[PDB]
Design a protein around this ligand. Sequence first.
Ligand SMILES: CSc1ccccc1CC(=O)N1CCC[C@H](O)C1
Ligand SMILES: [Zn+2]
Length: 139
Amino acid sequence: SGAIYVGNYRVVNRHLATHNDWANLVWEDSSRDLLVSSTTAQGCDTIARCDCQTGVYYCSSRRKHYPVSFSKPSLIFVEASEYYPARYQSHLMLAVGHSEPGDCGGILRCQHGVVGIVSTGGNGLVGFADVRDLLWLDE
Ligand SMILES: CSc1ccccc1CC(=O)N1CCC[C@H](O)C1
Ligand SMILES: [Zn+2]
């Protein structure tokens, strides 16, 4: 689990969104596994606006932050899970790192701010949904 709190927005994995998220919806995209809802309180996270390929992510199944190298956002084939059939997921970045299903939502960040959130994984890989192209999160 986990979210990004920027301005009056909450960014979560679409497959983990709550009823309150759906009832206060701003934007969602199943191909990216992202959903954004509105918040009453202002958040403290800032979004990175860069092309970094190195950063650090939070892994809840280890209680640890790990440094990683990650690919550029791309269209990647992801195996079937309990939330989606096997399909192509867009704007996804891959790295070598530990992950488990409940690690979705952990933040990936670089020197500039939040880059994305954990969205996929398996066998020593972790995948992150990028948010750096969503410029509207800043206004
Ligand atoms: C951190 S995810 C993970 C990690 C290790 C092993 C398996 C997973 C689960 C996963 O990849 N899922 C979960 C739901 C939505 C995704 O498209 C598919
Ligand atoms: Zn950066």
